[PDB]
Structures are given as structure tokens and as C-alpha cells.
Design a binder for this molecule. Structure first.
Ligand code: NDP
Ligand code: NDP
Ligand code: CB3
Ligand code: CB3
Ligand code: BOD
Ligand code: BOD
Ligand code: UMP
Ligand code: UMP
Lengths: 511, 511
């Protein structure tokens, strides 16, 4: 019973010019070091590698300490490796075998009592040979989210859908997303599947007296998206069937919380492609305090059209609104809170309270202040809006390390559709704000009120929950030097790096 | 050889009156009792042991207790006094009569080994006194009845009776949430005498894996107050030390949640006494839309005075504010959002948005509406306020079964002093609104922004955490018929039933 341990691009690339295709991945190496060494007393592990893999290592690190180094090679001799560097005392001498079947036979003969776990470390020669013989019980895969130029590739295998879109291998473990040198990645493991408390118990047994899960197989679920998935599953399992303003039935839960890290990667959800062009163009729209939805619509972003139609504005009891007008909406309250609205064309400069500018000036001069809030809810002008704000409130926070976090409260949540859009939108705002203030982005926290999935979306969401997440992408702000204030961002100032989602899921917007 | 004791108990240790139970029928208790005495892991059954009067107090259809070996301790009653009392059913075990508890335990070993699984002393005072003296009691199953009743028979005093009320040891290993039957709150505690299948997943868990705990013995944590206790513990252990607008050192955290049930009992926290006279007077102050802190100050609630002083009013740059005037405070926006403020004496009826009216109306008519929100935060009006509202927003949610839930978001949370007050203050509003809208109260959800403990409380809080919580009380609304609007309520229309909190800890208010 052997295990494979690899780092791998989406297109299964592993090496180039007999070296790693990426810049050094410190957290990947630490993870490698730990897996290959650790043991529950008397036994050391074994690291089986090829010649090209052995050679590609730095001289400093070979032989890999505390582990039986076995090199599969015909051309290299057992003494050339011995003459390469003097051996340090306390380690088994590096062993050379003809092929991989012969390599494991060596452990059967001479090391039957000493070795605990067996690890094949590279490369494509030994990996291919390992999967051929099928003696691999487990695969420890580091999924590099970014694509890199490669000439050596890891062989494709049943259930390699965990890398990109297309005896079996099922994921049992998915870690949260890590990053090094602007390279996002995460760790997965895959399985070859094909009376101190006796007194308490009966009190618990009677105490209960009273269906769907996200990716059942995956038992350790480090990935942060699991929040959102388990949140879908929960409302499908434990929510309440409700009616609606829209006329479409709803399953709703009240009081819901999600939080996502910003320090390593960006929570652009992977289980379905997120319309990022939308979250970007809409956020810049908000920041401008723009209330004209045509400016969005023309850019290819049609998210607001149905709620600013001639038909909808009349039902929303505003016959004197122009098509495209969202009223004094999200962005208007941010940049001009309380100001007298006229139309989308009127210039509202200097009028009202610019919450966004004050939130920054507070962050930049006095970050411990507890009044760093931006609201979109104005009970005075709710009726003048074409549709009341969902994401209505957000608070900011700085710690010791000059790291920035952001809470956002949402009154009403279309989990299937709006939520992943909302996560990504505000997390982006945190990145923007953090940069302008000279702070590290840390964490984004999502507070939810009415949290609901629409009944017509339910079939599509079970489809989404069969999908195990991919590593998060990195969002980079570009022209970091050129942008100094929050209004200096443009659409081209951003870069989504290594975003490899699952295929598009179609979901109708509830009018 | 070891025995378990199973009792229900008044805070004053009372167990009986007039050879019967002191309280009305508690179904959930009798359920607990039935299951705990009966449930057994094959060829095996449980023994129940009682006094003569316990046997007599018990209704005829229930004695002897089915599926359990009954033993009555008596010297007047004989074994044939009981056999003639009711024909024995086929299969059941005969009731045995011993003259003392040592004889009872002796009989159990002498004749009933290999026969009886577990031994339960069931009552009354005499046998509970006897069992505690012998030191044979391994576990105490206490049903803490929170309400004080007329009692002539009492459970004996024991080391560890600090779980009942204020003052070889008996410490809690289990505390459940508060239940209620017939206007009576209660909860269940258990006390203890002290004086590569999945292992291939575990190596990656090694490196990823890594001080103050409250009531650490309590292995089961049903009691919803544990949420708050652990929230204090987390802030201290895992928080970051910030400086403060007041100057006093702060340990703080961002984005933490709590939720409390309102269908069984009231989350008026028990681990320290909460100033309920304040929570009631402050809320009815808000409801009236009052901005005059002297109306609270004259009534014995001085919670706002340190913030309406001439010094603080001038430090907030408001020279013309009279002493007492909070400016457009929380009460003000609730009923007059956007109204132009003058002083506390000016009459504002009709001006601004009456959010509270709109909330109740939307509730009583269109409960599936998601715009059912109230907000104290008014960016344009913040400057004129003596203090920017801490609790700034609440949302209401109505269920399938006409069940009301409420979320409240609080930007800044004094976890030592303000948080339990706020839990109490909105749970009360939720009760009030529910009655006024003809709805069953279900849940209060607390969303928290800057969640912090002051450093001149750290010592005073570590002490509090040593205290395990008592059952929650019931808050009843008196004069239900007379009250039909939210303004109809007065301080007298309420009654806190079964409140048994721990001693007061002195915590100064930060100005
Ligand atoms: N991403 C990752 O996790 C890792 C990537 N790498 C990368 O992989 C590349 C090196 O791997 P690769 O190019 O595939 O070369 P290999 O590491 O597979 O080694 C090739 C040589 O080893 C011998 N060999 C290998 N497999 C067998 C076998 N089954 N039977 C007999 N002999 C065998 C052969 O010798 P002969 O010709 O004499 O038969 C062959 O020439 C480098 O670019 C390196 O950076 C390396 C380690 C980890
Ligand atoms: N809430 C609860 O958990 C429970 C409450 N109760 C309440 O308690 C009351 C009955 O209990 P209580 O009044 O204490 O009476 P008991 O049930 O303790 O029975 C009293 C009789 O039992 C015998 N006896 C008990 N202990 C001893 C001893 N150590 N040595 C010798 N004889 C003993 C004596 O019988 P004799 O005189 O024949 O020798 C005595 O007269 C009822 O009102 C009942 O409702 C009862 C059980 C549980
Ligand atoms: C949230 C928000 C902003 N908005 C505004 C907006 C307004 C009313 C709404 N009403 C309802 N019922 N659900 C919504 O998601 C919604 C969203 C959006 C509107 C539509 C889409 C939409 O049709 N979905 C995108 C997919 C984007 C994604 O991956 O999330 C699409 O493919 O068209 C997204 C966002
Ligand atoms: C929250 C809030 C509203 N308020 C108003 C108010 C105003 C300024 C504040 N400032 C600070 N820093 N913390 C607060 O909790 C606080 C509270 C209160 C203020 C004080 C007390 C107080 O002194 N404690 C109570 C004891 C209550 C308990 O034990 O929990 C007392 O006995 O007076 C209570 C409520
Ligand atoms: C950029 O500098 C650099 N870059 C690389 C090295 C290095 C030094 C020793 C050895 C190696 N490898 C050994 C094996 N590997 C591996 C990494 N992660 C996983 N999950 N599986 C692997 N099988 C990477 C290749 C790499 C030194 N220096
Ligand atoms: C008024 O109706 C009513 N009222 C009372 C009864 C009743 C029926 C069986 C038995 C009894 N006991 C009195 C209460 N006991 C008890 C209850 N909880 C705990 N935790 N420990 C106990 N020792 C034991 C025995 C009471 C029936 N009917
Ligand atoms: O950012 C958004 C915008 C809209 N919605 C969804 C949720 C609601 O179902 C609907 C708005 O309608 P009301 O909540 O106003 O009824 O749009 C979101 O989830 N997020
Ligand atoms: O109802 C209240 C009133 C006050 N505070 C506390 C929290 C903060 O510690 C302090 C307000 O300080 P600023 O957030 O305004 O700085 O008062 C509450 O938690 N709840």
C-alpha cells in the first residue's frame, strides 16, 4: 500500500526543464515535509523518487533527512550518489532500484519491520508506473490554481474532475486556499474507492425525540466554500416553505453567518462560475454613487434591467421614473446620504453625507474608532427606490497588525444567485479600501437576515452540491502606485489569478 | 455498588408539599424521569428505590413503576401491603420492602446481582439524606425547577448546591437549556462526585492543528448562556489589544454571533444579576421615542446620566444641549427617522419615519415581507447625537407557524456590561411585538460588530466564568387584553418569574 504526493497545475503540469514550473511554494514544501516524515514510534518513512527527480533537488536537501531515500534508476550507481557528498551519521544510505515493481520488493525484503508509510515523490515515470500497478491507496495532491508552462505531466486518472472541467479516485479531504508568490493552491487527499459519560447519555437520548448534504464523501472540509454549500444544504434540510412578493415559493432560514479569509486568496466561489465582471462593474458603479442602471446595462452587465423596466417602475408605484433609474439606491446613500434625489442625471456633488469618504478618513487617522460604518438603508427614501437594499450595512475594523476586516449585513438573501455575487462584491471592496488606507486585507464576515433558496432553483442547487470546490483565486490590484484614493480604481485595475471554477449553472432572476 | 439520585428541585431545595409535588404538571420532567430510570444497554433492568411517602404520593396507575424493580423503604409497610394494593402484571418485577437503605443495597447485591443494571434513589428527603451520608451516590440527576413554590419537604444540603441558588464534592458535568411547562421554567443538570482508513487523513491534520475556559468541567453545554460565557473566554484568549476612544485598554474581536430561544424561557442571563428594572425602563423610553435621560434618571436608572453630563455634552461639541438630552437618540429615530431635532422637550409626533409603526403593520398584514427592519443609525444626524447608537438595527421575521424571530446588529459590544443587557433588551421587544401582532415568540439572534471586553474587567470576568449558569426565567406579559398596541405597555405589565442569578460583580461604566 503506497501513497502519491504531488503538486499539480490545473492541466496536470508538474515540471519543466527538470525544475518546478512555479516560484517556490513554502507552504507546499512544509506540507510535503510533514506528510513524508510524521508517524504515530519505532518506524521511519520511505521516499521513492526517479533519477531526474533526485537530480533536480538541491545538493543541500538530498538525501531527504529522516526518510529512506530510494531512487529508481538504471544509469546511476549506488556509489556515485555516495561520492556526491559524505553521509551524515544516523540515516539509511540512498538506495537504487531497476524499476518501481522492483523498488517496493526491496522494502518487502530488507525493510519489512522499519518502514511505516511509503511515498512516491516523482516524477511522471514513477507516477505513471504507480497508477498502472494500482498499488496507490491514496493521493496527496497540491492543486496549484495557476497554470504554468510544463513539459512533464502527471497522468490523467478517473475522477480528475477535481483539477479542471472535462477503479476511481474520490476526494476525502479539501483544505482551505493558501498562497505564495502570487500563486494560489490548496491540498487535497484522494482515496482509491471503486462511566463518566455513560451517565450523561440517556438524558441526551430522550432529549431529541424528533436529508441532503454537501459532498458527502469529503470528511475533512477545510475549504471555506463549504460554508456556502452547507448553508444551501441546511436551508434545503431545515428551512421553511414560504410565499413571496415575487409570487415564486421560497424556503427560508433566519439568521445566517459566513466568514472568509482575505490574506491568502479571494473568495470567488468555485462550485459555479461567478459573474466577476458583474461584481466589479457594479461595485465601481456603487462607489461612483451612480443610480443609472443603463451605465451597467451597456457594459454587458444586465443584472439590474428587470428591476428598472417601464413595467416594474409603474408597479413599484413610480410612473415618473426613467427606465434605468434605481432611485436613491445603494451607491447614492453611500456617497450622498440624505440628499434630495431628482433623477439619475442630476449632479449630487457635495450634498448629503459621504459615508465612504468618512469611513476611510477614520480608518486612516483613527482606526480604533467603533463608528466606521456605511449604511444604504434610508427609511426616509425607501419608497423612492425601485427596490430596497439587500446588503444594507457594513462595518470596518482594524487590529494590531494593521489588518482590515469587514462585516456586511444583508436583510434578504437569494442563496443560489445573489449570495456568491455578494460575497465576492464586498470582499473586493475590502481589498480596495485596504489598499487606499495602507492596510492588509484580513477577513470578510457575512451577516444574513432572511436567507432563502427559491423553489425553482432547488433542482439546480442539488447539482451544485455534488461539486467539490476548487482552490480560490487571487485577486490582484494592479497599478498599486497610481491608485491613492477610493475613486481612483477603474475596471482594468484588477486581475483575477488562477480562477478554475466548475461549469456555468443557469438560474433565473426572480423579477 | 454505586447509586444515582434523580430529583426535581425548587431553588430553596424544596421537593414536596402535602405528600405531593409542589408545582403544576411538568410533562418534560416526567418524560426525562421515565427515560432515565428505564433505558438499559440485553438480559438486564434498572432498580428504583423510594420511601414510603413517595410511594403514597404517586398516582395508582403509575405504581409500581413499569419495567423497573421498585423498592420501598418502610417499617410500617410490609411486602404484602403492596401486593394486595394492585394485582401484579405478568412479566414485571415484584416490589420489595426494606427497613433501611443499607438493607436495600444489601438486598440488591444478595439477590439481584446479574439482574439489575442501575440503581436509582427516587425519593424522598429521608432516602436522599441517607444516600448522601453513605457516600454511595455517584451521580445526581437534578431537575432544577427555577420557580419558588410552597414546600414542606426538602432535598438535603450538599457540597455543590451552589448550582441551585446563592451561598467529597458534587460538580456539574451536564447543564441543559431551559424548558418550561405551565408557566414554570426548569432545566436538567447531572452532577458528579469528585472530591489508514481514516488515519491516512490525519497526517495533514497534524501541522494544521494547534487557555481560559469557563466551567470547563461541564462537558455538555446545552444552556444557551454558555454562548455568552464562551464568547467572553474567546475574546480574552484570542482577541487583539486595542487602545480606545476613552483611553482604557481593550481586548476585542470582530463578527461574533449568539442566538437565544424565546419559546420556552427568557434569556435574562443568570451568571451575574442583570438590572432588569433598567432594561424595561430603557426600552419603554425608546418606544415613547424619548430623548430625555432625566426621565430614566428620576426612575432609578442612571445608565445614561454619565453620557448626558455637561462635561460629556461639551466634549461631544454640543454646548446648547440641556442636561439629559441624548440628542436624536435611538428612541428618536425608531419613531421619527429623519425628523429635524430641536430639544428633548419639543413634540415630534408625526414628523419623520415611524419605523416601529411600519414594522408592526407589515407584521400584522404581510408577514412574508423582507423589508421588516428598524434602524437607529442616521449618518446625517450622528453629529447631533450625544452618542452614536451601539444597537443600530433590528430585523423581524415571521415563520410558517406565526413564529416571530428577531435579529439585532450591534456595532460595538461591551461584553462585560452591555451585552447581557442588550440580549435582554431586544428579547423583551420581541416578546412585546409578538403579543401586539398576535404571534408566538421563537428566537432572538444577536449579531455583533466590535465585540470587546475592557481590561479593567478582565479579573472581574475570569471570576464570572467560574460560575455555571442557572435556568433562565420566564417573563410574562401581564394584562394581555388591555395591551393591543406597542405604546399600550407600561412598566407594570411585566413579571419576571423564577429568576435566580449569581452575585453582583462591580463593573464601572466607561464614559
Ligand atoms: N510537482 C511535483 O510534485 C514534482 C515535480 N517534479 C518535477 O518532475 C520532473 C522530473 O520528473 P520526470 O521528468 O518525470 O523524471 P522522473 O523523476 O520520472 O525520472 C526519470 C528517470 O528515472 C528512471 N525511472 C523513472 N521511473 C521509472 C520506472 N517506472 N522504471 C524504471 N525506471 C524509471 C528512468 O531512468 P532510465 O532512463 O535509466 O530508465 C528515467 O530516466 C522535474 O521537472 C521536477 O521538477 C519532481 C518532484 C515533485
Ligand atoms: N420532586 C421530587 O423529586 C420528589 C418529591 N417527592 C416528594 O416528597 C414527599 C415524600 O417524601 P418524604 O416526605 O421525604 O417521605 P419519604 O418518601 O422519604 O418516605 C418517608 C418514609 O420512608 C421511610 N424511610 C425513609 N428514609 C428512611 C431512613 N433513612 N431510615 C428509615 N426509614 C426511612 C420511613 O418509613 P416508615 O415510617 O414506614 O419506617 C418514612 O416514614 C412527597 O410530598 C413527594 O411529592 C418524592 C420523590 C421525588
Ligand atoms: C446579488 C446581486 C446583484 N444583483 C441585483 C439583483 C436584484 C434583484 C434580485 N432578485 C433576486 N430574487 N435574486 C437576485 O439575485 C437579485 C439580484 C443581481 C441580479 C441578477 C443576477 C443574476 O442573474 N445572476 C448572474 C450570476 C452571478 C453570480 O454568479 O452570482 C447571472 O448569471 O446573470 C446576479 C446579481
Ligand atoms: C447596554 C446598555 C444600556 N446602558 C447604557 C450604556 C451607556 C454607555 C455605556 N458605555 C459602556 N462603555 N458600556 C456600557 O455598557 C454602556 C451602557 C447601560 C449602561 C450601564 C449599565 C450598568 O451600569 N450595568 C447595570 C448592570 C446590568 C448587568 O449586570 O448586566 C447596572 O447595574 O447599572 C447598564 C446598561
Ligand atoms: C525555487 O527553489 C526551489 N524549488 C524547489 C526545491 C526543491 C528541493 C527539494 C525537493 C523538491 N521537490 C521534491 C518534491 N516536490 C513536491 C512538492 N510538493 C508536493 N506536494 N509534492 C512533491 N513531490 C517538489 C520538488 C524541490 C528547492 N528550491
Ligand atoms: C398532578 O399530576 C401528577 N403529579 C405527579 C405525578 C407523579 C407520577 C409518578 C411519579 C411522581 N413522582 C414525584 C416526582 N418524581 C420525580 C420527578 N422528577 C425528578 N427529576 N425526580 C423525581 N424523583 C418521582 C416520583 C409523580 C403524576 N401525576
Ligand atoms: O444583492 C442582492 C440583491 C438582491 N438579492 C435578492 C434577495 C431578494 O430575494 C431579492 C430582493 O427582494 P426583496 O428582498 O426586496 O423582497 O433579491 C440578493 O440576494 N442580493
Ligand atoms: O446599548 C449599549 C450601549 C453601550 N454599549 C457599550 C459598547 C461600547 O463599549 C460603548 C460605546 O462606545 P463607542 O463604541 O461609542 O466608542 O458602550 C453597549 O454595548 N450597548
Amino acid at each position: 500500500p503506497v501513497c502519491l504526493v504531488v503538486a499539480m497545475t490545473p492541466k496536470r503540469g508538474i515540471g519543466i526543464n527538470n525544475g518546478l514550473p512555479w516560484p517556490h511554494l513554502t507552504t507546499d514544501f512544509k506540507h510535503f515535509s510533514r506528510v513524508t516524515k510524521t508517524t504515530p514510534a519505532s518506524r521511519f518513512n520511505a521516499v521513492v523518487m526517479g533519477r531526474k527527480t533526485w537530480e533536480s533537488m538541491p545538493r543541500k536537501f538530498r538525501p531527504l533527512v529522516d526518510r529512506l531515500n530510494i531512487v529508481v534508476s538504471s544509469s546511476l550507481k549506488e556509489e556515485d550518489i555516495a561520492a556526491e557528498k559524505p553521509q551524515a551519521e544516523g540515516q539509511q544510505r540512498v538506495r537504487v532500484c531497476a524499476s518501481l515493481p522492483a523498488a517496493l520488493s526491496l522494502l518487502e525484503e530488507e525493510y519489512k519491520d522499519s518502514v511505516d508509510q511509503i511515498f512516491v515523490v516523482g516524477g511522471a515515470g514513477l507516477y505513471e508506473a504507480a497508477l498502472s500497478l494500482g498499488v496507490a491507496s491514496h493521493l496527496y495532491i497540491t492543486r496549484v490554481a495557476r497554470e504554468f508552462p510544463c513539459d512533464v505531466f502527471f497522468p490523467a486518472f478517473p475522477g480528475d474532475d477535481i483539477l479542471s472541467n472535462k477503479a476511481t479516485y474520490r476526494p476525502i479531504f479539501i483544505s482551505k486556499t493558501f498562497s505564495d508568490n502570487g500563486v494560489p493552491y490548496d491540498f487535497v487527499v484522494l482515496e482509491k474507492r471503486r462511566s463518566s459519560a455513560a451517565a450523561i447519555a440517556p438524558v441526551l437520548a430522550w432529549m431529541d425525540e424528533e436529508l441532503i448534504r454537501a459532498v458527502p464523501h469529503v470528511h475533512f472540509r477545510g475549504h471555506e466554500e463549504f460554508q456556502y454549500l452547507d448553508l444551501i444544504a441546511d436551508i434545503i434540510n431545515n428551512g421553511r416553505t414560504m410565499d413571496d412578493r415575487t409570487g415564486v415559493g421560497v424556503i427560508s432560514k433566519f439568521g445566517c453567518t459566513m466568514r472568509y479569509s482575505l490574506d491568502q486568496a479571494f473568495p470567488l466561489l468555485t462550485t459555479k462560475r461567478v459573474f466577476w465582471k458583474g461584481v466589479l462593474e457594479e461595485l465601481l458603479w456603487f462607489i461612483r454613487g451612480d443610480t443609472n442602471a443603463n451605465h451597467l446595462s451597456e457594459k454587458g452587465v444586465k443584472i439590474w434591467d428587470k428591476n428598472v423596466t417601464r413595467e416594474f417602475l409603474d408597479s413599484r408605484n413610480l410612473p415618473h421614473r426613467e427606465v434605468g433609474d434605481i432611485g436613491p439606491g445603494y451607491g447614492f446613500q453611500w456617497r450622498h446620504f440624505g440628499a434630495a434625489y431628482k433623477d439619475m442625471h442630476t449632479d449630487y456633488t457635495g450634498q448629503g453625507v459621504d459615508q465612504l469618504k468618512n469611513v476611510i478618513q477614520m480608518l486612516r487617522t483613527n482606526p480604533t474608532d467603533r463608528r466606521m460604518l456605511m449604511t444604504a438603508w434610508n427609511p426616509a427614501a425607501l419608497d423612492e427606490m425601485a427596490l430596497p437594499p439587500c446588503h444594507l450595512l457594513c462595518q470596518f475594523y482594524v487590529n494590531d497588525q494593521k489588518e482590515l476586516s469587514c462585516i456586511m449585513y444583508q436583510r434578504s438573501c437569494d442563496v443560489g444567485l445573489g449570495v456568491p455575487f455578494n460575497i465576492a462584491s464586498y470582499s473586493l471592496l475590502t481589498l480596495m479600501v485596504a489598499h487606499v488606507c495602507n492596510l492588509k486585507p484580513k477577513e470578510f464576515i457575512h451577516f444574513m437576515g432572511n436567507t432563502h433558496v427559491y423553489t425553482n432553483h432547488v433542482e439546480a442547487l442539488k447539482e451544485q452540491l455534488r461539486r467539490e470546490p476548487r482552490p480560490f483565486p487571487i485577486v490582484n490590484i494592479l497599478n498599486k502606485e497610481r491608485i491613492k484614493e477610493i475613486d481612483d480604481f477603474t475596471a482594468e485595475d484588477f486581475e483575477v489569478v488562477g480562477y478554475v471554477p466548475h461549469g456555468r449553472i443557469q438560474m433565473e432572476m426572480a423579477v
